[PDB]
Design a binder for this molecule. Structure first.
Ligand SMILES: [Ca+2]
Ligand SMILES: [Ca+2]
Ligand SMILES: [Ca+2]
Ligand SMILES: [Cl-]
Ligand SMILES: [Cl-]
Ligand SMILES: [Cl-]
Lengths: 330, 33
């Protein structure tokens, strides 16, 4: 389960980089797995097993109840400002099994909003307004397009705002080079901290330095700084085993100066190809078995989309993401 | 003196302590999209 979620996060990350090897990445693994686990409440047979194995659960060792309860407890763990919500937007005439709507509310905290997708601009605005509210205005356009024949959309959002334990002073932020490669740079506002003592590990074998910066309360961020031109080689080593080794190797070190850019990045993704590469196939096909939603094998996934935003500044950071699973008739 | 200078591509990971799930992950290849 911990192992599953870490294995899933790094498997997904590697597929995102393969698809767009020259772009920034920001995403939320937990948003994606929660949306897909929500979907799996309604899946059967091969459609189900592919989703849950794609999320990296071992179905010989873990039951579906254990999986859904892990997301229920995670949702409690999330709800410093941290929030996560789930919703289903459903054509009002679509007949839904009581078990599906009850389990969605109990396990995922999801209501069912009757939605007229044939009035597609209004349906799109309702979903986008739901996500805008959940993300405190940071994600306004999760849904770019919505087919008038859509039957259901499952939505997850996450919002995380935190203050640094040791905030940067804006008077120490100065324009400095950020090297895109050995020969080319861009100028960025470079924040700095001085004379701090934090967890640190120089990994000479993997040509990278790892540190932890704390937030207030009980959260922190793991940073991995590859030597120049070693990012791809570090990425190839991402795994539960490597992350655990890094965590086990951190020791407190006095740092004279730490420099971190002030910046915001965002990414929007179509995850269809990504999820197929993870083995989630039948849900998208004419053979989809989502018969736990309606009682009939009459629904298939059309698209899974994800958007995420990261803002790093002197006082703290803000992170938000959302995932939508669009479903049509077969 | 140890200096840590994030002036080239780097990764960040938010790991939840209550579950050890990864809530967010990023690669910063260019801070100015
Ligand atoms: Ca077991
Ligand atoms: Ca080196
Ligand atoms: Ca290289
Ligand atoms: Cl879209
Ligand atoms: Cl090397
Ligand atoms: Cl991150």
């Amino acid at each position: 389960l911990a192992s599953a979620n870490v294995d899933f996060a790094f498997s997904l990350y590697k597929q995102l980089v393969l698809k767009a090897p020259d772009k920034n990445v920001i995403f939320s693994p937990v948003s994606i797995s929660t949306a897909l686990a929500f979907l799996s409440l309604g899946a059967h047979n091969t459609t189900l097993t592919e989703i849950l194995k794609g999320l990296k659960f071992n179905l010989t060792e873990t039951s579906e109840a254990e999986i859904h309860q892990s997301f229920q407890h995670l949702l409690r763990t999330l709800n410093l400002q941290l929030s996560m919500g789930n919703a289903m937007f459903v054509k009002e005439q679509l007949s839904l099994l009581d078990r599906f709507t009850e389990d969605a509310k109990r396990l995922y905290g999801s209501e069912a909003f009757a939605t007229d997708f044939q009035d597609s601009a209004a349906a799109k605005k309702l979903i986008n307004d739901y996500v805008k509210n959940g993300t405190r205005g940071k994600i306004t356009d999760l849904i770019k397009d919505l087919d008038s024949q859509t039957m259901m959309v499952l939505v997850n959002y996450i919002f995380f705002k935190a203050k640094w334990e040791m905030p940067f002073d804006p008077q120490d932020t100065h324009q400095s080079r950020f090297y895109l490669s050995k020969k080319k740079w861009v100028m960025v506002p470079m924040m700095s901290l001085h004379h701090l003592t934090i967890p640190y590990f120089r990994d000479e074998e993997l040509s990278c330095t790892v540190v932890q910066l704390n937030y207030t309360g009980n959260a922190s961020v793991f940073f991995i700084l590859p030597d120049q031109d070693k990012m791809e080689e570090v990425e190839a080593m991402l795994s539960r085993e490597t992350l655990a080794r890094w965590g086990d190797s951190l020791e407190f070190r006095e740092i004279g100066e730490l420099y971190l850019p002030k910046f915001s990045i965002s990414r929007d993704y179509n995850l269809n190809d990504i999820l197929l590469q993870l083995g989630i196939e039948e849900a998208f096909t004419s053979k989809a078995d989502l018969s736990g939603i309606t009682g009939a094998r009459n629904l298939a996934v059309s698209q899974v989309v994800h958007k995420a935003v990261l803002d790093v500044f002197e006082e703290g950071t803000e992170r938000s993401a959302a995932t939508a699973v669009k479903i049509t008739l077969l | 003196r140890t200096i840590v200078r994030f002036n080239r591509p780097f990764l960040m990971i938010i790991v939840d302590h209550f579950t050890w799930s990864i809530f967010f992950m990023s690669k910063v290849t260019n801070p100015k999209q």
